[PDB]
Every structure is written in C-alpha cells, then in structure tokens.
Amino acid sequence: NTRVIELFDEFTDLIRDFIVRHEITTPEYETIMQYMISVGEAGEWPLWLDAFFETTVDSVSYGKGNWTSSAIQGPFFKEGAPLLTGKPATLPMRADEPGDRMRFTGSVRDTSGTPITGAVIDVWHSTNDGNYSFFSPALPDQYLLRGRVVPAEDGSIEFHSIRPVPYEIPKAGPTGQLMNSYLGRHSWRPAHIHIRITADGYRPLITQLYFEGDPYLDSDSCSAVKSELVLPVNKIDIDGETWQLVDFNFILQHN
Amino acid sequence: ANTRVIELFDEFTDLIRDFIVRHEITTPEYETIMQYMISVGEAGEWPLWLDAFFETTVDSVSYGKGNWTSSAIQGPFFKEGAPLLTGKPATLPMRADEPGDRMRFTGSVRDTSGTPITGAVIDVWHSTNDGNYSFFSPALPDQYLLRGRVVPAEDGSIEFHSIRPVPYEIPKAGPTGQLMNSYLGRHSWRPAHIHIRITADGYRPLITQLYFEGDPYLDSDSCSAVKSELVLPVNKIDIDGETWQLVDFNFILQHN
Numbered sequence: 001n002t003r004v005i006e007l008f009d010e011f012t013d014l015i016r017d018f019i020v021r022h023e024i025t026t027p028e029y030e031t032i033m034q035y036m037i038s039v040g041e042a043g044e045w046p047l048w049l050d051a052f053f054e055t056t057v058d059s060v061s062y063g064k065g066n067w068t069s070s071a072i073q074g075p076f077f078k079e080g081a082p083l084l085t086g087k088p089a090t091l092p093m094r095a096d097e098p099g100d101r102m103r104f105t106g107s108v109r110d111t112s113g114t115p116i117t118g119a120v121i122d123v124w125h126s127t128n129d130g131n132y133s134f135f136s137p138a139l140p141d142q143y144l145l146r147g148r149v150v151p152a153e154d155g156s157i158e159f160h161s162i163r164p165v166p167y168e169i170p171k172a173g174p175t176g177q178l179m180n181s182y183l184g185r186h187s188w189r190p191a192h193i194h195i196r197i198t199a200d201g202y203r204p205l206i207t208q209l210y211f212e213g214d215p216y217l218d219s220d221s222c223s224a225v226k227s228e229l230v231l232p233v234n235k236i237d238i239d240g241e242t243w244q245l246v247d248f249n250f251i252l253q254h255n
Numbered sequence: 256a257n258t259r260v261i262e263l264f265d266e267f268t269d270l271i272r273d274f275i276v277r278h279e280i281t282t283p284e285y286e287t288i289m290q291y292m293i294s295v296g297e298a299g300e301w302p303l304w305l306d307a308f309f310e311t312t313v314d315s316v317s318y319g320k321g322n323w324t325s326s327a328i329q330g331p332f333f334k335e336g337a338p339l340l341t342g343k344p345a346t347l348p349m350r351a352d353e354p355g356d357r358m359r360f361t362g363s364v365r366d367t368s369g370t371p372i373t374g375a376v377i378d379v380w381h382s383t384n385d386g387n388y389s390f391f392s393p394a395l396p397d398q399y400l401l402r403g404r405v406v407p408a409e410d411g412s413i414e415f416h417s418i419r420p421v422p423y424e425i426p427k428a429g430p431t432g433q434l435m436n437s438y439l440g441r442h443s444w445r446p447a448h449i450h451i452r453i454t455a456d457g458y459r460p461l462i463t464q465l466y467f468e469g470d471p472y473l474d475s476d477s478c479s480a481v482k483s484e485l486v487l488p489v490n491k492i493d494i495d496g497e498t499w500q501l502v503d504f505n506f507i508l509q510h511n
C-alpha cells in the first residue's frame with residue numbers, strides 16, 4: 001500500500017516520460033494495447049515477463065557473490081517431485097530414450113567448504129525432443145526427467161539422465177512473434193538443466209546450468225545466462241551410446 | 256522488424272530493468288505484479304487500465320493546441336456504427352424511463368476561418384447515470400444505447416437531446432478499481448462527460464470530451480483528462496413543467 005504508492009507513481013512518471021520523449025502516436029499506442037491483450041489472451045504473461053525481466057528480479061532478491069549463481073525459476077517448474085535412490089541414480093525416462101546419454105557429478109558445500117548433508121536437490125529439463133515434462137500434448141503429466149536428489153554424507157552428488165538441447169519459445173505465440181518477427185531475432189534458449197536446492201538453516205538456491213559451445217549462449221531468449229554457469233563437456237563414446245559427463249560444485253546460503 | 260520497435264523496446268527493457276534494480280523489486284513483489292497483470296487481462300480491463308493511466312499523455316503529444324477545439328482522450332468505450340439520429344428533436348437512443356435529467360445540447364462545427372462544415376458527422380457517446388456504457392457492461396445489452404450520430408444543418412448548427420451525464424466511478428471490484436481505491440487510497444470517479452468525435456472530408460478528425468461547470472470532480476479526474484476550454488456552463492430552464500439542461504459548444508475543425 002505505501003510501497004505500491006511509491007513504485008506505482010515512480011513507474012507512471014517513467015512510462016509517461018517514455019511516451020513524451022518518443023512522441024508515441026495513437027496508432028502506436030493502440031498497437032501496444034492490442035499486443036498486451038494478445039499476451040493475456042494466450043497465457044504468456046509469466047512466459048513474457050520471465051523471458052525479459054526475471055533474470056533481473058533474481059539478481060536483486062537473492063544476491064550477486066560467491067553464492068553459486070541464481071537463475072530464473074521458469075514456467076515448467078516441478079512441485080512434489082519424486083525421491084531417487086536408484087542404482088547409478090537415473091532420472092525417470094521413457095524407455096529407448098533418444099538423445100545423448102549424460103552424467104552429472106557434483107557437490108553441496110558452503111562458505112567454509114563443509115558439506116551440508118541436510119540438502120535436497122530438485123532437477124528438471126527438456127527432452128532431446130525439445131519438450132518439458134507435465135505440459136505438452138506429446139507427454140504424459142507424469143514425472144519425467146524431473147526429481148529430488150539427496151547428497152551423500154560426505155557431500156557429493158551424482159545423477160544420470162540424458163543431454164538436454166536448446167528449446168525455442170513458440171515461433172507463433174505473441175512472445176515468439178516479438179522475438180522472431182517484430183524484433184527480428186530468435187526465440188531459442190541455450191540447452192540447460194534446471195536445479196533447485198533446499199535445506200534447514202540455508203537460503204534456497206534456484207538456477208540452471210548450460211553447456212560449452214552452446215550456440216545460443218551469447219543470445220538467451222530469457223537472458224538467464226551467466227559465465228559461472230556454463231559447464232565443461234567431456235565427450236566419451238561408451239560405444240553404441242556416446243556419453244557426456246559434467247561436474248558442478250553448488251555452494252549455498254547460510255540463513 | 257521495425258527499428259522503431261527495435262530501438263524503443265530495447266530502451267524500454269533497459270528502463271524497466273533499471274527500475275527493478277533501483278527499487279529492489281522482490282520476487283514476491285514481481286509475482287504480485289505478474290498476477291495483477293493477469294487479473295487485468297481477465298477482467299478484460301486493459302483498455303480501461305491503459306487509457307486511465309496513460310491516454311492523457313499520448314493525447315498531449317499527438318494533437319496540438321491552437322484556435323481549434325481542444326482534443327481529449329477517447330477512452331475505451333467508443334463503438335463504431337452508431338445510428339444516424341434524425342428527428343424533430345434528435346435524441347440518443349435510450350431505454351424506456353432512462354434515469355436522469357433531460358439535457359439539450361446545442362452548438363456548431365466550423366473551420367479555423369468561421370465557415371460552417373456541413374459535411375461533419377458528430378458521434379456522441381456517454382454512460383448511463385448508473386455508471387455503464389453500452390457494449391461494455393454485462394448490465395447493458397449490446398445495442399446502441401446513449402450513442403448516436405448527429406449532422407449539422409445547412410448553416411452549421413448541431414442539436415441533440417439526451418439524459419444528463421453524471422460522475423462515473425470505475426468499478427471498485429475490478430483490477431483497475433482496486434489499484435486506484437484500495438492500493439493507492441485514491442478515488443476512481445471521472446466527472447460527467449459527453450464523448451465526441453467529429454469527422455469531415457477535408458478536415459482532421461477531432462476526438463474530445465465535454466465537461467460540466469461545477470462538476471464535483473473537475474479537479475480530481477481519476478483519469479486526468481479534463482481541460483478548462485472543455486468545461487461547459489450549464490443553464491437550467493423549465494419548459495412544460497420540465498427541468499431541461501442547456502449546454503452549448505462551438506466546435507472548430509482544422510483543415511486536412
């Protein structure tokens with residue numbers, strides 16, 4: 001209420017000032033209004049807002065230091081994921097899964113460098129097909145390439161899955177329309193894998209990890225890229241199946 | 256890809272991002288913002304919302320002051336295709352026993368040089384006293400009520416009749432209403448206004464609004480669309496034991 005008065009008026013002055021400086025004409029104004037009505041008539045608001053701004057909303061709420069870097073949450077988020085204690089600890093995947101086989105390896109330590117046994121690491125990512133879990137007419141609503149993973153008591157974590165590939169935001173919806181058509185660019189996101197991490201007495205982390213030589217690194221449609229988060233790739237041909245091995249050392253909050 | 260859009264949008268994103276940073280806009284603040292947006296769309300309230308907070312500004316950069324009638328914001332309640340009012344005393348279509356004081360509006364349309372523009376067509380629209388515009392209220396049918404078109408006579412005079420508008424209040428229940436009332440501790444009343452559009456071959460179309468002298472809300476328009484050259488004196492008159500309100504205004508169009 002007093003906070004919204006502050007921002008709202010500060011916001012207002014700013015847009016008005018934009019209209020005045022750029023002499024926004026009526027047809028223009030009307031084209032914006034129609035456009036916004038679009039975005040809402042589809043369901044792309046969270047899509048649209050997260051794609052341009054949440055990278056910034058994250059660089060403020062969490063912070064910007066040796067905390068291992070934060071990345072956008074993203075509409076695709078998994079709630080109530082399944083616990084995993086598998087043999088080499090695979091993620092749930094439809095049999096004879098296309099895509100490169102992938103192995104992630106890493107840790108959960110803090111400031112000091114001592115493991116935080118009480119951690120819970122939630123992971124999710126798209127198919128090689130370019131479709132996420134739950135929501136796509138081509139996929140069941142059932143937990144696939146999503147899950148919750150506990151670290152070892154020394155800290156270390158590991159899981160198997162498949163190698164994600166760059167997803168493009170629909171070339172056809174208002175957001176894509178903007179990225180592709182009117183702005184004349186691309187709506188591709190670099191191949192990434194999502195991560196959340198919970199604990200007792202630690203601030204939660206939410207982020208992504210990308211890959212080296214990812215074509216859309218230096219042009220993420222959602223601007224969620226940092227340097228600290230681009231992973232080194234180890235190409236190993238366990239023959240028939242070719243493998244991709246990756247490492248990461250997640251550090252955390254501290255309440 | 257328009258460079259207009261390219262250059263503008265880019266600056267726009269920089270602006271908004273600096274804003275987030277300058278004001279330490281938090282995740283739960285951001286989620287509230289996003290949620291409010293969604294709610295605005297669902298109330299189908301984007302035109303009401305943008306015109307309210309911004310049309311004034313676009314209007315002020317997109318048509319001049321000078322010796323022609325001042326423009327003012329169109330707002331979200333215009334509809335094309337209102338009927339030609341033809342008649343012994345033209346009257347806006349109205350429901351039976353429509354609440355409110357008979358008003359009679361007189362005036363004319365001329366050019367910046369005094370010539371009557373007999374080719375003008377004047378659209379007029381306003382709300383009901385109950386505070387509703389036809390085509391934009393589930394409480395009114397999608398028919399032309401309090402909307403119509405008037406033409407000048409060979410000599411330039413316009414004349415129509417109608418109920419008298421009264422101050423309108425953007426609905427407190429809706430997203431916009433919440434914003435203004437609850438969140439900003441401000442009201443959401445506009446003052447009584449007649450909406451006008453005049454078009455005519457040869458001339459630049461005029462979209463303006465007319466207000467009433469003494470209106471409780473002149474100095475407090477929620478939408479901030481009032482202009483003094485646009486404030487009509489009202490003249491109370493009795494005819495056949497009838498409290499008519501006279502309101503007169505002389506429009507001047509620009510050439511082109």
Ligand SMILES: Oc1cc(Cl)cc(Cl)c1O
Nearest residue numbers: 306307329330331423478
């Ligand atoms: O012409 C109007 C414009 C806006 Cl924004 C709001 C109302 Cl209530 C109007 O009557």
Ligand SMILES: [Fe+3]
Nearest residue numbers: 074076126194
């Ligand atoms: Fe993703």
